[PDB]
Design a protein around this ligand. Structure first.
Ligand code: NA
Ligand code: NA
Length: 263
């Protein structure tokens, strides 16, 4: 049937308190790497990995493209660069398809489509006050929208200024060809076979997250079909997005979507 491990970007976290983007993101990838090995111990191993947003670092590590130390180095480097933007940007989950979302935000230069969740769910990202105005406009149209609280909002033009620093501080990264299959969510073209280098991580933090497209490709018979998707997290937040994407793209197909832990 095929098993996919899905690594979320900003999953739930909560036994000492993790404080600030750097500490929180480090506890997240630490928990992802340790939960992945726990699954392996009970015979369950991934044939393919998909990383969502900041989760693509952990997915690149599990796939063998980067070492655990290299993954932690990307995590710490990126988190330190993003920290001065703490609280400035926000995200919103909209119950709109991607073309309707693009139309809604076309006149907001600082707000972009951040994540393709599923066909009828799209996340936007940008300055928190602009995200609030857009939530109000979506609600005023008798449509649904909700805030997605995050330490620093990636996948929007505020990340452009951090890309030179990323390309510079991660210059000596030595990624390898992955040992396990990985579908990147960084590029609209899923056949852009990516080298998981400095340029890839600088691009990944700014580009939209092509999550629906990566899940649909994994579920498709093209390049082999996978039927079990396991979110490797402390609480399942992407499971309904996985099912909504797969049911829409292959309506007569059977898929199983599950988490690792639950709060
Ligand atoms: Na815009
Ligand atoms: Na496939």
């Amino acid at each position: 049937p095929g098993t996919v491990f899905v690594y979320s970007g900003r999953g739930s976290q909560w036994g000492e308190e993790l404080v600030g983007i750097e500490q929180i993101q480090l506890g997240l990838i630490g928990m992802q790497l340790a939960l992945t090995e726990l699954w392996c111990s009970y015979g369950v191993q991934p044939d393919l990995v998909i990383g969502h947003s900041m989760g693509e670092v952990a997915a690149a590590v599990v796939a063998g493209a980067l070492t655990p130390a290299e993954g932690l180095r990307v995590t710490a480097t990126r988190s330190r660069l993003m920290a001065p933007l703490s609280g400035q940007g926000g995200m919103a989950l909209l119950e709109l398809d991607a073309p309707t979302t693009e139309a809604l935000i076309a006149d907001f230069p600082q707000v972009t489509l951040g994540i393709y969740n599923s066909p009828r769910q799209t996340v936007i990202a940008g300055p928190t006050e602009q995200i609030d105005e857009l939530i109000t406009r979506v609600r005023a149209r008798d449509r649904f929208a909700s805030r997605v609280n995050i330490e620093v909002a990636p996948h929007n033009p505020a990340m452009d200024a951090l890309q030179p620093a990323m390309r510079s501080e991660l210059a000596d990264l030595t990624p390898r060809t992955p040992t396990i299959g990985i579908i990147s969510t960084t590029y609209a073209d899923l056949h852009t076979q990516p080298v998981f280098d400095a340029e890839h991580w600088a691009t990944n933090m700014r580009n939209p997250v092509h999550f629906q497209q990566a899940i649909a490709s994994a579920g498709s018979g093209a390049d082999g079909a996978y039927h079990t998707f396991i979110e490797i997290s402390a609480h399942p937040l992407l499971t309904q997005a996985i099912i909504d994407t797969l049911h829409s793209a292959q309506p007569g197909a059977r898929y199983t979507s599950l988490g690792t832990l639950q709060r």
